A paper describes a structure:
Furthermore, [name] also transduces targeted oxygen-dependent degradation of important regulatory proteins with N-terminal cysteine residues, following removal of genetically encoded N termini. The drug chelates [name]’s metallocofactor and can alkylate one of its ligands.
The most likely mechanisms for the implied C-N fragmentation involve nitrogen-centered radical generation. To capture the anticipated initial state of the HYZ•[name] reaction in vitro, we first purified and crystallized the Fe(II)•[name] complex as previously described. Thus, the Fe(II) crystals did not capture the expected prereaction complex. However, attempts to identify conditions that recapitulate covalent coupling to [name] in vitro were unsuccessful, and we posit that a reactant is likely to be present in vivo that is needed to oxidize the drug to initiate its decomposition.
Numbering used by the authors: 4 to 22, 41 to 73, 77 to 144, 146 to 228, 241 to 269
């Protein structure tokens, strides 16, 4: 057989996908990465499925760094029971993720964009609970709530591109869950490529209003060591 570990493979293919007979192009490369990810079971990373009140000093979610180049990041997000990763964007990024244990809800949205043929400004009479300050009203943007399914390790991988399902919210459902995440290019808060947060305003794909909000006071994510086979 003589092959590298499945995680070494994924990392190879993510590098090929995001940087003599003709080699793959972007679509075939993205479909193969998707293929490699679907096979990924929790035990291939030596991730024991977790289960089971948390002290205000304990992170609601944790992160295991597997690998990072300028083309992609590769890691695992792990949500303790009841937590959730708030609604955030991925500015100009592709992304793939694969739930390893437990279950999650993902809600996939997008801000309307006149490049896709849709027409984006808020009616001034529009009213929401809670009401909106002046600086807030100037910052709301139209979006679309595309999906809200909940996924388990049986489901396929979840994909995102610069222009679709680029905003999402992950809720740990019925206990703790964890997922492998690929992001390309990786975030860079120093290169003006940050992870921005949003809430949906409250006055079946529907036009919704989104507001950008700071990172929630009680949401943070901490490193924790990675038990699986090492990359390269
Ligand atoms: N990244 N933020 C944070 N970092 N460390 C501890 C924290 C404890 C409570 C709320 C936020 C926290
Ligand atoms: Fe994300």
């Amino acid at each position: 057989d003589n092959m590298a570990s499945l995680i070494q493979r994924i990392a190879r293919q993510a590098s090929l996908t995001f940087r003599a007979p003709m080699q793959p192009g972007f679509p075939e490369n993205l479909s193969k990465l998707k293929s490699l990810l679907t096979q990924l079971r929790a035990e291939d990373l030596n991730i024991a499925p977790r289960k089971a009140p948390l002290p205000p000093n304990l992170p609601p979610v944790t992160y295991m760094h597997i690998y990072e180049t300028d083309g992609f990041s590769l890691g695992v997000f792990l949500l303790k029971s009841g937590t959730s990763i708030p609604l955030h964007d991925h500015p100009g990024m592709h992304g793939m993720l694969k739930v390893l244990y437990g279950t999650v809800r993902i809600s996939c949205m997008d801000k309307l964009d006149a490049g896709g043929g849709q027409r984006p400004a808020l009616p001034p009479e529009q009213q929401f609970e809670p009401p909106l300050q002046p600086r807030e009203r100037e910052a709301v943007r139209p979006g679309v709530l595309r999906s809200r399914a909940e996924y388990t390790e049986a489901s396929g991988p979840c994909i995102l591109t610069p222009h679709r399902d680029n905003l999402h919210q992950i809720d740990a459902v019925e206990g703790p869950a964890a997922f492998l995440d690929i992001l390309a290019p990786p975030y860079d808060p120093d290169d003006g490529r940050d992870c921005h947060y949003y809430r949906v305003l409250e006055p079946l794909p529907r036009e919704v209003w989104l507001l950008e909000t700071p990172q929630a006071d009680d949401f943070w994510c901490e490193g924790e060591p990675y038990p699986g086979p090492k990359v390269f």
